[PDB]
Amino acid sequence: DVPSKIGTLLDLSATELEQVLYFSKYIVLDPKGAILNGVPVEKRQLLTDEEYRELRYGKQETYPLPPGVDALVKDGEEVVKGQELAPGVVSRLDGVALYRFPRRV
Amino acid sequence: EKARDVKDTSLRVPPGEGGIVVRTVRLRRGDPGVELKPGVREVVRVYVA
Amino acid sequence: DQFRVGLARLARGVRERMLMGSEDSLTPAKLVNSRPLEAAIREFFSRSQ
Amino acid sequence: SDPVRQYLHEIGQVPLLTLEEEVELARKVEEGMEAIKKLSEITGLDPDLIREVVRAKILGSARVRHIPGLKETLDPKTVEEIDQKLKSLPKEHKRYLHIAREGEAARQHLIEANLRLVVSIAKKYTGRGLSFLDLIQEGNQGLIRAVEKFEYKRRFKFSTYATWWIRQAINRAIADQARTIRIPVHMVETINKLSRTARQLQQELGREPTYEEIAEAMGPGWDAKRVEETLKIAQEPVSLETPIGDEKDSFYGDFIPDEHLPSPVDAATQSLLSEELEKALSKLSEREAMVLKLRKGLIDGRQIENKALRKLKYHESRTRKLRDFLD
Amino acid sequence: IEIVVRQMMKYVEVTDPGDSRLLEGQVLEKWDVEALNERLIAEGKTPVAWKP
Amino acid sequence: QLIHKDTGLIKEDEVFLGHIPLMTEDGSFIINGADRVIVSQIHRSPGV
Amino acid sequence: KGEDVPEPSVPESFRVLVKELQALALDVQTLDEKDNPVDIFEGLASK
Amino acid sequence: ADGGKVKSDVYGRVEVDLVRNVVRVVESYDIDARMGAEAIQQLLKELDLEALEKELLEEMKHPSRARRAKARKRLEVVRAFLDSGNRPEWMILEAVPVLPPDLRPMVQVDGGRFATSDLNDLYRRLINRNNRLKKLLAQGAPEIIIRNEKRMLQEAVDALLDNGRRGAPVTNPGSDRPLRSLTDILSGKQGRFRQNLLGKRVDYSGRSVI
Amino acid sequence: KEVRKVRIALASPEKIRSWSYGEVEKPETINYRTLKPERDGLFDERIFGPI
DNA sequence: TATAATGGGAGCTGTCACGGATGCAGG
DNA sequence: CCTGCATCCGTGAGTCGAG
Ligand SMILES: [Mg+2]
């Protein structure tokens, strides 16, 4: 019912309140020292699904290897964005690369 | 007189209506060519002119 | 038009029963459900404006 | 905007498992359960308790709720007590804790991974009296049952074993919730069988069958009366808001009288009855008054008995005006 | 018609709150703001400035 | 007729689809014992 | 009985209104001049 | 690990690798972020109305017209909640009321069949979805599932209180007729007010041709 | 006491619970065979009252 | 209780005029 | 960024009777 009472009290647009109540975007009660995109997370901030997934569960990615092809990098080795994991594969992010299901021992 | 198991539900002539009864129709369950809606034992129509 | 609607629904039923069941033993009798067609026509002649 | 499209979007976020990943997750789950049994053998706690503590730690601090199965209330305090009694175990025993944890994580991942299957199964069940999303949810319950009951040893792809449980739960839901007046599942089976049979008979006869023909195609024990009663019990109620007329004007429920509440003439009937009975009882001697009114229950609501009986027979034949109350 | 128009003229909007707890732009009945003003004047307080 | 693409087996049959209400000589119908009339409906003719 | 008609009491439709407003999670109270609750349900709806 | 020899550099979640014999901490935060009526209710309980009243009062002195307007519009709600003694968190429902069975009757008609109110079907939806939500909670369902379930619950409460208000209206199977909610009952031309209150059908009445 | 006023206000969950004669648990109406109100159902007599 | 199965489906189209809020290009 | 005008969304649209 416009203007929204709950929306007015908490100072949120109809669209935002819609997004939160119907489970589209999250909203932060306790930042707990979180940092996203270089700016720390302010309270009452609307996070998308991906954003919250990244903040809470961390960022990671899996890269498929064409069958019968060995990689250029080993298990547990640090990886930089742009560094290629195989002759056909390049990594998007930083962090540690790990071996998923070795075919040959 | 002892209490009777049933009560009088009979179809009576509505207020302001009436006439001579011209016709009657009686459809019963167990009659040849006669099948009512489920649960219905019998159906009676009275045509009054 | 209502016949067509009930017929398309009947077709949906046909495909739905085609994907399932034994792909060997099936007949047009076991595929075709007329209920949506009957319901479409009856709904038309009964409840239409 | 559209709930279904949103769910289908949230479903397309989790990528599908490669065979190795499926096998891995299933294995981790099974070994996790085994590890929970092991920790039960070690610590001496309830397998359910330990399982729910492990699950509590895996899911997060967001979800801790009392479980109907447990013998104790599960608060974060208690999950921390139990977690502290698990962590304080020797190393070789403490291994099984980690095994169980990664087991639960693998379980979550496994359930979340196969959610599309539930959609593709529930899309065939549309229009049976349950909404799409509800079918999807019950199918999800089936999927969870599948994950808990799945054995990767048999070398069967998970979709095979899961499909059965999904169909099972979806059908259970359709049978349970789709009728305003609840009819037990077996009776629903009976009704549906009757309907299919009638459709067959009518398909071959080129006309709607009678109760007797249905009784014939029904086999032994079935007669016309049973078919009629079964069709009678299969009748769904109709809405009071069912529109009457072409316009928005009146509802079907406006034509139905209330047969419960006494109309003023009925309250007046009771009043006049008690009054006339009280006034025409002048014959009564006091002893016969209290005793005969206790006979008919006119006081507390529940030889001289015979003389009072006879006197009442005497006063009935007298005024001849009480017939009206007798209908 | 005068009765109805009278009902249309019933309301005022606060131009200045004065010493009241009222807000600028708030709309209230003319009667209420007049009783409030007459009470504030009796209290020696600055009254509420309102627009018809 | 049911026709299999692979097999090629053709199973032909006549199935009963139910009844279509018939119009009487005068142009009305009898639906559930009561005489009814289907009223013709004017509308915008499709096109561009 | 030939006597005068009694004083009318609260109409049932208003009760229906109150209960339907309650099912909407809104409390509708009938009060006296002292701002105390008056019960139109005569203790029937109160535990 | 190692009796306290090795510890963590950054905030994160723990994956214990037994194969590689390494404790690997994925970089993540404990951040508390929620969705829906839980989050909103939490935000409502935290509200200090006097404080917000002060802030809005400070905003009331700004030379901008629009800002004073919006500050006023907010302060009206705030002060409403203040004076009424109503807690804002009451705008979110924990216990949903249930209307007496005689105001939503299941009654056998003349023909022996049954007639029933749509409120019964709405209540049925709500109850079923609440039960399923509870069971899914007790069984440790994943995130997405519980999310969708909570959404469905919210839409069931929506359907019950006001139907068709948000999204497409809830209808009965094989029917295009939107079910009648409490809101539909109260308001409208056929609503309880206009139909059964401001006017009534009366006894001791009649009619005829003049 | 004559009613001189009608007040309308938000209902706390505690108030809503203080109204209720019981929680409706099962989404059931009446028994199919007996046509009596089902226990803990929408029509249950143990909550709302005797038929 | 085990071949494997992994993102839905219908849509309703010829009123009209208002208050209020919300948003965007312009001074 | 503050004002003004364009645009979207929700809300209304006579009475009684009969069906
Ligand atoms: Mg037989």
Tab-separated table of N, CA and C in Angstrom, chain D residues 188-293:
chain	number	residue	atom	x	y	z
D	188	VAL	N	-8.212	-42.975	-2.245
D	188	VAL	CA	-7.966	-42.173	-3.435
D	188	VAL	C	-7.569	-43.084	-4.592
D	189	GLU	N	-6.734	-44.077	-4.297
D	189	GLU	CA	-6.342	-45.066	-5.294
D	189	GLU	C	-7.576	-45.780	-5.833
D	190	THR	N	-8.445	-46.206	-4.919
D	190	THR	CA	-9.706	-46.847	-5.286
D	190	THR	C	-10.539	-45.969	-6.226
D	191	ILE	N	-10.722	-44.708	-5.842
D	191	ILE	CA	-11.495	-43.761	-6.642
D	191	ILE	C	-10.914	-43.574	-8.044
D	192	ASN	N	-9.607	-43.341	-8.119
D	192	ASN	CA	-8.933	-43.160	-9.404
D	192	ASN	C	-9.059	-44.390	-10.298
D	193	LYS	N	-8.925	-45.565	-9.690
D	193	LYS	CA	-9.111	-46.826	-10.399
D	193	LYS	C	-10.520	-46.901	-10.980
D	194	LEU	N	-11.504	-46.530	-10.164
D	194	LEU	CA	-12.902	-46.521	-10.586
D	194	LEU	C	-13.112	-45.593	-11.782
D	195	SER	N	-12.494	-44.417	-11.724
D	195	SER	CA	-12.597	-43.437	-12.801
D	195	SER	C	-11.991	-43.952	-14.104
D	196	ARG	N	-10.779	-44.494	-14.021
D	196	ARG	CA	-10.122	-45.062	-15.195
D	196	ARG	C	-10.971	-46.174	-15.809
D	197	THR	N	-11.487	-47.049	-14.949
D	197	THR	CA	-12.347	-48.146	-15.380
D	197	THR	C	-13.573	-47.632	-16.127
D	198	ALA	N	-14.236	-46.634	-15.548
D	198	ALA	CA	-15.412	-46.032	-16.171
D	198	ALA	C	-15.076	-45.420	-17.528
D	199	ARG	N	-13.916	-44.773	-17.616
D	199	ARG	CA	-13.469	-44.186	-18.875
D	199	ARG	C	-13.245	-45.262	-19.936
D	200	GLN	N	-12.695	-46.398	-19.517
D	200	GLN	CA	-12.489	-47.527	-20.422
D	200	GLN	C	-13.810	-48.093	-20.936
D	201	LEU	N	-14.699	-48.427	-20.004
D	201	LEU	CA	-16.009	-48.971	-20.347
D	201	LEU	C	-16.774	-48.038	-21.271
D	202	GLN	N	-16.701	-46.740	-20.994
D	202	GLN	CA	-17.400	-45.760	-21.815
D	202	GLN	C	-16.717	-45.599	-23.168
D	203	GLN	N	-15.418	-45.876	-23.210
D	203	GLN	CA	-14.675	-45.787	-24.459
D	203	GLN	C	-15.062	-46.930	-25.390
D	204	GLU	N	-15.235	-48.120	-24.823
D	204	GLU	CA	-15.617	-49.282	-25.624
D	204	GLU	C	-17.119	-49.360	-25.931
D	205	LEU	N	-17.948	-48.799	-25.053
D	205	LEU	CA	-19.404	-48.881	-25.217
D	205	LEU	C	-20.018	-47.744	-26.034
D	206	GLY	N	-19.241	-46.693	-26.279
D	206	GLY	CA	-19.745	-45.532	-26.993
D	206	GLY	C	-20.834	-44.791	-26.236
D	207	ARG	N	-20.739	-44.808	-24.908
D	207	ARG	CA	-21.721	-44.180	-24.027
D	207	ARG	C	-21.281	-44.340	-22.579
D	208	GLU	N	-21.838	-43.525	-21.689
D	208	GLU	CA	-21.501	-43.621	-20.272
D	208	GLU	C	-22.127	-44.870	-19.660
D	209	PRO	N	-21.320	-45.657	-18.937
D	209	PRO	CA	-21.765	-46.933	-18.372
D	209	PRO	C	-22.701	-46.723	-17.194
D	210	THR	N	-23.456	-47.756	-16.843
D	210	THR	CA	-24.280	-47.716	-15.645
D	210	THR	C	-23.438	-48.161	-14.458
D	211	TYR	N	-24.032	-48.156	-13.271
D	211	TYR	CA	-23.326	-48.578	-12.069
D	211	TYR	C	-23.042	-50.077	-12.116
D	212	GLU	N	-23.939	-50.818	-12.760
D	212	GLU	CA	-23.822	-52.270	-12.854
D	212	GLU	C	-22.692	-52.703	-13.783
D	213	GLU	N	-22.512	-51.980	-14.884
D	213	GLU	CA	-21.447	-52.285	-15.834
D	213	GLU	C	-20.087	-52.010	-15.202
D	214	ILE	N	-20.011	-50.906	-14.467
D	214	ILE	CA	-18.818	-50.574	-13.704
D	214	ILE	C	-18.548	-51.658	-12.668
D	215	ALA	N	-19.607	-52.115	-12.004
D	215	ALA	CA	-19.495	-53.206	-11.040
D	215	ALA	C	-18.984	-54.486	-11.702
D	216	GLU	N	-19.349	-54.680	-12.966
D	216	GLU	CA	-18.877	-55.824	-13.738
D	216	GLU	C	-17.381	-55.722	-13.994
D	217	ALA	N	-16.951	-54.596	-14.556
D	217	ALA	CA	-15.540	-54.418	-14.892
D	217	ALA	C	-14.659	-54.229	-13.656
D	218	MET	N	-15.288	-54.061	-12.496
D	218	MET	CA	-14.564	-53.899	-11.236
D	218	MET	C	-14.118	-55.223	-10.619
D	219	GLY	N	-14.763	-56.315	-11.017
D	219	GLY	CA	-14.428	-57.625	-10.489
D	219	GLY	C	-15.276	-58.047	-9.304
D	220	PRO	N	-14.734	-58.939	-8.460
D	220	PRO	CA	-15.442	-59.533	-7.319
D	220	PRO	C	-15.629	-58.568	-6.151
D	221	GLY	N	-16.733	-58.723	-5.424
D	221	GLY	CA	-17.007	-57.907	-4.255
D	221	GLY	C	-17.643	-56.573	-4.597
D	222	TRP	N	-17.548	-56.190	-5.866
D	222	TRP	CA	-18.078	-54.915	-6.331
D	222	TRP	C	-19.488	-55.056	-6.894
D	223	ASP	N	-20.402	-54.238	-6.385
D	223	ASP	CA	-21.762	-54.185	-6.904
D	223	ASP	C	-22.111	-52.744	-7.250
D	224	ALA	N	-23.359	-52.514	-7.643
D	224	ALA	CA	-23.809	-51.177	-8.015
D	224	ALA	C	-23.790	-50.217	-6.827
D	225	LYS	N	-24.245	-50.703	-5.674
D	225	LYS	CA	-24.323	-49.885	-4.468
D	225	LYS	C	-22.959	-49.343	-4.054
D	226	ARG	N	-21.937	-50.191	-4.120
D	226	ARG	CA	-20.589	-49.784	-3.744
D	226	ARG	C	-20.025	-48.741	-4.704
D	227	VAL	N	-20.269	-48.930	-5.998
D	227	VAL	CA	-19.837	-47.972	-7.009
D	227	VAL	C	-20.495	-46.617	-6.767
D	228	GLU	N	-21.789	-46.647	-6.470
D	228	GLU	CA	-22.547	-45.426	-6.225
D	228	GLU	C	-22.065	-44.700	-4.967
D	229	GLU	N	-21.802	-45.458	-3.906
D	229	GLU	CA	-21.302	-44.879	-2.661
D	229	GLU	C	-19.893	-44.313	-2.823
D	230	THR	N	-19.081	-44.985	-3.634
D	230	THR	CA	-17.707	-44.561	-3.881
D	230	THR	C	-17.673	-43.282	-4.712
D	231	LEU	N	-18.536	-43.210	-5.722
D	231	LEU	CA	-18.677	-41.991	-6.508
D	231	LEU	C	-19.244	-40.868	-5.643
D	232	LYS	N	-20.086	-41.240	-4.683
D	232	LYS	CA	-20.678	-40.284	-3.751
D	232	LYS	C	-19.629	-39.684	-2.819
D	233	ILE	N	-18.683	-40.511	-2.384
D	233	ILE	CA	-17.631	-40.056	-1.481
D	233	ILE	C	-16.563	-39.257	-2.235
D	234	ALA	N	-16.540	-39.410	-3.556
D	234	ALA	CA	-15.540	-38.757	-4.393
D	234	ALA	C	-15.958	-37.348	-4.795
D	235	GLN	N	-17.135	-36.929	-4.344
D	235	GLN	CA	-17.658	-35.613	-4.690
D	235	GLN	C	-16.954	-34.501	-3.919
D	236	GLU	N	-16.384	-33.552	-4.656
D	236	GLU	CA	-15.732	-32.402	-4.049
D	236	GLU	C	-16.757	-31.305	-3.784
D	237	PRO	N	-16.601	-30.582	-2.665
D	237	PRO	CA	-17.528	-29.496	-2.333
D	237	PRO	C	-17.434	-28.344	-3.331
D	238	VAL	N	-18.446	-27.481	-3.345
D	238	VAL	CA	-18.464	-26.331	-4.243
D	238	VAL	C	-18.331	-25.036	-3.441
D	239	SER	N	-17.753	-24.011	-4.058
D	239	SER	CA	-17.499	-22.751	-3.369
D	239	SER	C	-18.768	-21.929	-3.169
D	240	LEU	N	-18.865	-21.276	-2.016
D	240	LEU	CA	-19.991	-20.404	-1.714
D	240	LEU	C	-19.917	-19.125	-2.537
D	241	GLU	N	-18.716	-18.795	-2.998
D	241	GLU	CA	-18.501	-17.583	-3.779
D	241	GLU	C	-18.689	-17.832	-5.272
D	242	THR	N	-19.133	-19.038	-5.617
D	242	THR	CA	-19.420	-19.382	-7.003
D	242	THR	C	-20.419	-18.386	-7.575
D	243	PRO	N	-20.006	-17.656	-8.622
D	243	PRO	CA	-20.777	-16.540	-9.179
D	243	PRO	C	-22.137	-16.962	-9.724
D	244	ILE	N	-23.177	-16.252	-9.300
D	244	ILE	CA	-24.526	-16.476	-9.804
D	244	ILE	C	-24.948	-15.320	-10.702
D	245	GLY	N	-25.201	-15.627	-11.968
D	245	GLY	CA	-25.543	-14.606	-12.936
D	245	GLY	C	-24.348	-14.239	-13.792
D	246	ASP	N	-24.580	-13.380	-14.777
D	246	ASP	CA	-23.529	-12.952	-15.690
D	246	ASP	C	-22.630	-11.901	-15.047
D	247	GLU	N	-23.199	-11.139	-14.119
D	247	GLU	CA	-22.486	-10.038	-13.482
D	247	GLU	C	-21.795	-10.440	-12.183
D	248	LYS	N	-21.307	-9.432	-11.469
D	248	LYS	CA	-20.610	-9.608	-10.198
D	248	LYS	C	-21.579	-9.556	-9.011
D	249	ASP	N	-22.876	-9.590	-9.304
D	249	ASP	CA	-23.904	-9.156	-8.361
D	249	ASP	C	-24.064	-10.045	-7.121
D	250	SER	N	-24.489	-11.294	-7.288
D	250	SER	CA	-24.738	-12.153	-6.128
D	250	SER	C	-23.938	-13.456	-6.142
D	251	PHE	N	-23.846	-14.095	-4.979
D	251	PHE	CA	-23.104	-15.342	-4.836
D	251	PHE	C	-24.040	-16.498	-4.501
D	252	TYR	N	-23.617	-17.707	-4.853
D	252	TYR	CA	-24.399	-18.918	-4.620
D	252	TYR	C	-24.737	-19.122	-3.144
D	253	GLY	N	-23.892	-18.594	-2.265
D	253	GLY	CA	-24.080	-18.751	-0.834
D	253	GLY	C	-25.160	-17.851	-0.263
D	254	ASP	N	-25.634	-16.908	-1.069
D	254	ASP	CA	-26.684	-16.000	-0.627
D	254	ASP	C	-28.056	-16.663	-0.714
D	255	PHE	N	-28.112	-17.811	-1.381
D	255	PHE	CA	-29.359	-18.553	-1.516
D	255	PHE	C	-29.505	-19.705	-0.517
D	256	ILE	N	-28.513	-19.870	0.352
D	256	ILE	CA	-28.535	-20.960	1.322
D	256	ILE	C	-28.909	-20.484	2.724
D	257	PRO	N	-30.004	-21.031	3.274
D	257	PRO	CA	-30.471	-20.688	4.622
D	257	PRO	C	-29.600	-21.316	5.706
D	258	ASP	N	-29.650	-20.762	6.915
D	258	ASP	CA	-28.952	-21.350	8.053
D	258	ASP	C	-29.901	-22.260	8.824
D	259	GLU	N	-29.628	-23.559	8.778
D	259	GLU	CA	-30.522	-24.546	9.368
D	259	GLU	C	-30.225	-24.776	10.846
D	260	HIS	N	-29.213	-24.087	11.361
D	260	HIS	CA	-28.780	-24.303	12.738
D	260	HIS	C	-29.488	-23.391	13.736
D	261	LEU	N	-29.246	-22.089	13.624
D	261	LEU	CA	-29.845	-21.117	14.534
D	261	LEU	C	-31.367	-21.111	14.460
D	262	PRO	N	-32.025	-21.273	15.617
D	262	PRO	CA	-33.488	-21.252	15.681
D	262	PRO	C	-34.039	-19.899	15.251
D	263	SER	N	-35.008	-19.909	14.342
D	263	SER	CA	-35.717	-18.692	13.969
D	263	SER	C	-36.546	-18.268	15.179
D	264	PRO	N	-36.912	-16.975	15.261
D	264	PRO	CA	-37.669	-16.450	16.407
D	264	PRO	C	-38.881	-17.302	16.789
D	265	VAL	N	-39.499	-17.934	15.797
D	265	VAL	CA	-40.668	-18.772	16.029
D	265	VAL	C	-40.308	-20.063	16.764
D	266	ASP	N	-39.050	-20.479	16.660
D	266	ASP	CA	-38.584	-21.678	17.355
D	266	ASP	C	-38.289	-21.399	18.829
D	267	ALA	N	-37.660	-20.259	19.098
D	267	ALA	CA	-37.427	-19.824	20.469
D	267	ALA	C	-38.770	-19.580	21.143
D	268	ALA	N	-39.691	-18.989	20.386
D	268	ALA	CA	-41.055	-18.793	20.858
D	268	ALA	C	-41.761	-20.134	21.046
D	269	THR	N	-41.364	-21.131	20.260
D	269	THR	CA	-41.928	-22.473	20.383
D	269	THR	C	-41.521	-23.097	21.710
D	270	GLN	N	-40.230	-23.037	22.017
D	270	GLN	CA	-39.736	-23.531	23.299
D	270	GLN	C	-40.374	-22.783	24.465
D	271	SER	N	-40.426	-21.458	24.350
D	271	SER	CA	-41.023	-20.621	25.385
D	271	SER	C	-42.475	-21.002	25.656
D	272	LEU	N	-43.289	-20.994	24.605
D	272	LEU	CA	-44.707	-21.325	24.718
D	272	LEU	C	-44.934	-22.761	25.184
D	273	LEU	N	-44.017	-23.655	24.827
D	273	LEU	CA	-44.120	-25.045	25.253
D	273	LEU	C	-43.896	-25.168	26.755
D	274	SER	N	-42.804	-24.585	27.245
D	274	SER	CA	-42.519	-24.596	28.679
D	274	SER	C	-43.621	-23.897	29.469
D	275	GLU	N	-44.156	-22.821	28.901
D	275	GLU	CA	-45.231	-22.072	29.541
D	275	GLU	C	-46.512	-22.895	29.653
D	276	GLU	N	-46.983	-23.421	28.525
D	276	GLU	CA	-48.199	-24.232	28.505
D	276	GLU	C	-48.077	-25.483	29.363
D	277	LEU	N	-46.900	-26.099	29.344
D	277	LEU	CA	-46.656	-27.260	30.184
D	277	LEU	C	-46.685	-26.873	31.658
D	278	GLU	N	-46.108	-25.723	31.993
D	278	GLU	CA	-46.115	-25.258	33.379
D	278	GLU	C	-47.525	-24.935	33.885
D	279	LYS	N	-48.339	-24.312	33.035
D	279	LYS	CA	-49.671	-23.861	33.443
D	279	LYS	C	-50.724	-24.972	33.476
D	280	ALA	N	-50.552	-25.988	32.636
D	280	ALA	CA	-51.508	-27.092	32.570
D	280	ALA	C	-51.152	-28.223	33.534
D	281	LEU	N	-50.104	-28.012	34.323
D	281	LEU	CA	-49.661	-28.994	35.309
D	281	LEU	C	-50.342	-28.800	36.666
D	282	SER	N	-51.339	-27.917	36.705
D	282	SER	CA	-52.079	-27.596	37.929
D	282	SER	C	-52.601	-28.825	38.682
D	283	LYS	N	-52.808	-29.921	37.957
D	283	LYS	CA	-53.200	-31.194	38.560
D	283	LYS	C	-52.211	-31.687	39.618
D	284	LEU	N	-50.934	-31.361	39.427
D	284	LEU	CA	-49.835	-31.911	40.225
D	284	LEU	C	-49.921	-31.666	41.732
D	285	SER	N	-49.825	-32.743	42.505
D	285	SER	CA	-49.529	-32.635	43.928
D	285	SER	C	-48.029	-32.383	44.035
D	286	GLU	N	-47.577	-31.834	45.157
D	286	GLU	CA	-46.182	-31.400	45.278
D	286	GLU	C	-45.147	-32.530	45.151
D	287	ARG	N	-45.378	-33.637	45.856
D	287	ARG	CA	-44.515	-34.818	45.751
D	287	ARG	C	-44.485	-35.355	44.323
D	288	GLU	N	-45.667	-35.535	43.743
D	288	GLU	CA	-45.764	-35.946	42.351
D	288	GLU	C	-45.211	-34.860	41.435
D	289	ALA	N	-45.210	-33.608	41.886
D	289	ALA	CA	-44.663	-32.540	41.060
D	289	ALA	C	-43.155	-32.700	40.930
D	290	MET	N	-42.465	-32.782	42.063
D	290	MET	CA	-41.009	-32.901	42.044
D	290	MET	C	-40.541	-34.244	41.464
D	291	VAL	N	-41.241	-35.317	41.816
D	291	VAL	CA	-40.867	-36.650	41.348
D	291	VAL	C	-41.180	-36.878	39.855
D	292	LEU	N	-42.324	-36.387	39.378
D	292	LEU	CA	-42.670	-36.524	37.958
D	292	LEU	C	-41.880	-35.550	37.076
D	293	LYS	N	-41.534	-34.390	37.626
D	293	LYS	CA	-40.666	-33.476	36.895
D	293	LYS	C	-39.225	-33.980	36.900
